Design a binder for these strands. Structure first.
Lengths: 136, 136, 136
DNA sequence: AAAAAAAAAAAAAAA
C-alpha cells in the first residue's frame, strides 16, 4: 500500500502492579474494535506514572452495567453525576476525561503474553474492602 | 532442495544498550521464516558499531503499520518517501537500505537467553520524548 | 552376545586447536543416530593432521540450512555448485568428499569430558573476519 | 456480566 503517516504512540513504560489503585482517566479515545464494535478506549494514569488501558465496548448486554460501575467510581471520588443519557454519545465521552477512579488490575493472557490489565472500576465499598487487607 | 546461498553471519559482539538510539539500516535481506512467512531482515548499526536485527514479517495484519513506522522513522530523518506501493516488493527492498532511523531496544527473553532486541521504529515525536529525559 | 567382528577405528590422535581453520572433508559416511535419525558423518583433516568430526543430522527444521552452509564453504574454496537436489541422497553424499572448507571449532562438554568440536562451516568473508580479531 | 487485544521472529542435533 501507499505510505500514510502513522500516529504517535504513547510510551507505556510502567504497568500497574496487581491489586487495587487510585487512578485518573488521563485520556479517552473513540475507536472501533477489530471485530467492528464501537468502543471508548480509557487511558489510565496512576500516582507513580503507571499506565493502563480499558475498553468500554458498546452494543451488548453488559455495556450499560459496565459503564454504571465507571460512573459509580467517579461518583465516589467526589463528583456529581449529571442528568444525562449515558452511552455512545459526546456527553458521556467528554464527561469521563480527567476523572478520579478506583481500578482493579488482574493478570491476563493473550497470544501467550501475560500483561497487567485493568479489569474493573470499583465503588468505595469495593476499593476499601480490598485496600484494608494490606499491611504497610 | 536446489542450492541457495545462505546469508552471511556477523559477529554479534557489541549489541545496543537498552533504550532508544539513532541507527542506520546497514543491510536488508530476503528470508523465509521457520513458520514459512516471507520477511525482510534489517541489520541495524549504531554510532559505535552496535548491532541488532529486526524481523519485518509479511502476511500478518500488523505488516502494514509495522512498515509504516519504519518508513515514518526514515521520513523524520530527512529522507522523503516515494509515491510507491510499499510491501513485499523490490522498490521497498532497495529503499530501506542505508537509511538513518530511530529505534527502540528492549530486553527479550527467549528459551532462557535474554538479549537486547530491536522492538520498534520510532517517529520524531516518539524519539525526542524518550531522549529528552536523559541527564548529564 | 555372539561375537561379531567390530570395525576398525580411525586414529584421532591430534585435534584442532580452538578457532578457524582450513580443512578438507577426508571421509563421509552415512549412519543412524542414537535417537535414530539418518545423518552424514563428515571427517575433517587439518593441514597439520588435525582430526575433527561434524554431524549433519537430517529430519529437523534446520537440516537444509546446515547443509547450505557446508556448500557455501565449498563454494568459497574454488568449487562450483552443480544444479542438483541437495539432501539425503547419493549425489550430495559423493559431492562432499574431498572438498576444501573453512571450519570453526569450539570447546564442548558431554559427560564431563571436554572436546574441541567442529561447530560450523564458514564462508570466505566469515573466515577472514574471524582471523582479523585473532590478531589482537 | 461481554468483549478487548501488534503479530511475528528466534537452531537443532550429535556424542
Amino acid at each position: 500500500s501507499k505510505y500514510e503517516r502513522p500516529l504517535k504512540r504513547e510510551s507505556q513504560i510502567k504497568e500497574f502492579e496487581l491489586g487495587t489503585h487510585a487512578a485518573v482517566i488521563e485520556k479517552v479515545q473513540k475507536k472501533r474494535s477489530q471485530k467492528g464494535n464501537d468502543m471508548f478506549l480509557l487511558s489510565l494514569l496512576g500516582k507513580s506514572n503507571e499506565k493502563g488501558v480499558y475498553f468500554l465496548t458498546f452494543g451488548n448486554d453488559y455495556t450499560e452495567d459496565n459503564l454504571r460501575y465507571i460512573l459509580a467510581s467517579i461518583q465516589d471520588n467526589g463528583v456529581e453525576i449529571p442528568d444525562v443519557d449515558f452511552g455512545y454519545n459526546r456527553e458521556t465521552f467528554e464527561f469521563l476525561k480527567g476523572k478520579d477512579v478506583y481500578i482493579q488490575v488482574e493478570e491476563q493472557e493473550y497470544k501467550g503474553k501475560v500483561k497487567h490489565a485493568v479489569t474493573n472500576f470499583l465503588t468505595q465499598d469495593e476499593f476499601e474492602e480490598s485496600e484494608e487487607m494490606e499491611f504497610s
